Design a binder for this molecule. Structure first.
Ligand SMILES: [K+]
Ligand SMILES: [K+]
Ligand SMILES: [K+]
Ligand SMILES: [K+]
Ligand SMILES: [Mg+2]
Ligand SMILES: [Mg+2]
Ligand SMILES: [Mg+2]
Ligand SMILES: [Mg+2]
Ligand SMILES: [Mg+2]
Ligand SMILES: [Mg+2]
Ligand SMILES: [Mg+2]
Ligand SMILES: [Mg+2]
Length: 176
RNA sequence: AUCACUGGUGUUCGGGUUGUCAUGCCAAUGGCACUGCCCGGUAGCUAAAUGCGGAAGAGAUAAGUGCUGAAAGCAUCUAAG
C-alpha cells in the first residue's frame, strides 16, 4: 500500500522493459529480470515505474507493495550494486579467495571450499574479512547466509563467522 | 553363499579285538552278538570353518534454520518468489 504508492525512479542509463508480467532491468552493473505476481499492474510512465493492483485479486495491494520493493532493489542493483561484509572471529580462523571459490579455515579437520554463484564476487582484504559484491540483493544475502552457516557465532566468546554489522550477545559460563 | 583350509559325521573303505557257530581239519575266512565292541577314514552333507553383505550417491521432506519480502512506511522464514 504505502510502499506500493511511492513510485521508483529510473536514473539515466537504466533501461527497463516490460513484457506483460515479465520485467527486465538493464544497467551498467548487469541485467536482472523478474516475473511479477499476476495481480500487479506496473507502468513505465515517464522515467518512473508505478505499481498497482489488478482488478479481481483480493491481495493486489499486498502484491503490489512487494513488487515495488523488489523493482526498487533491481534498480539499485544495476547501478550502485550491493555489498556484504563478513568477519571471522577465533584463533586460527582464516579466509582466502581463489577465483570464485572461498577457502575457509574454521577449526575443522577438513577444508571448506565454497563455490560462489554466477554473479557474485568475493575479495578478502585481511585474512579475517570477506567482502561480497553483486547486483542481486537476494542472491548476495543467500551467499552470506551460507558462509555464516559453516560456523555460526557461538554465545560464549563470539567465535565463528559473523556479519560485520551483527550484534553478537555473549554470556558467561555458569558458576560453580 | 560355499567346502579350499580347520573339523564333525562317514552302519557303503581299511584295520584291531572278545565270545560262539560254520566252511572236513590246519591255515585262511564268513555269520551272529547295538555297526558285538572299538581305532582310523573317502565322497557327500555340514559349523565351530571362511568369503561376502548393511552403504555411498540421488530425489522430495519432518522438526528446525534461513534469504529476499509486502500486507502493516517499521518489523516479519511467507502472503508472491
Ligand atoms: K570341509
Ligand atoms: K569330510
Ligand atoms: K568269528
Ligand atoms: K526478513
Ligand atoms: Mg573337498
Ligand atoms: Mg576328521
Ligand atoms: Mg567311525
Ligand atoms: Mg584256525
Ligand atoms: Mg548263524
Ligand atoms: Mg541266533
Ligand atoms: Mg542418504
Ligand atoms: Mg521489509
Amino acid at each position: 500500500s504505502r510502499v506500493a504508492k511511492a513510485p521508483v525512479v529510473v536514473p539515466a542509463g537504466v533501461d527497463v522493459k516490460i513484457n506483460g508480467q515479465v520485467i527486465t532491468i538493464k544497467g551498467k552493473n548487469g541485467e536482472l529480470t523478474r516475473t511479477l505476481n499476476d495481480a500487479v499492474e506496473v507502468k513505465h510512465a515517464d522515467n518512473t515505474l508505478t505499481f498497482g493492483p489488478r482488478d479481481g485479486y483480493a491481495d493486489g495491494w499486498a502484491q503490489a507493495g512487494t513488487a515495488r520493493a523488489l523493482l526498487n532493489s533491481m534498480v539499485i542493483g544495476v547501478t550502485e550494486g550491493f555489498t556484504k561484509k563478513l568477519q571471522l572471529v577465533g584463533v586460527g580462523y582464516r579466509a582466502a579467495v581463489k577465483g570464485n571459490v572461498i577457502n575457509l579455515s574454521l577449526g575443522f579437520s577438513h577444508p571448506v571450499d565454497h563455490q560462489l554463484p554466477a554473479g557474485i564476487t568475493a575479495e578478502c582484504p585481511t585474512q579475517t574479512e570477506i567482502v561480497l559484491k553483486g547486483a542481486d540483493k537476494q542472491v548476495i544475502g543467500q551467499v552470506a547466509a551460507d558462509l555464516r552457516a559453516y560456523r555460526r557465532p557461538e554465545p560464549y566468546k563470539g567465535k565463528g563467522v559473523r556479519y560485520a554489522d551483527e550484534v553478537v550477545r555473549t554470556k558467561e559460563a555458569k558458576k560453580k
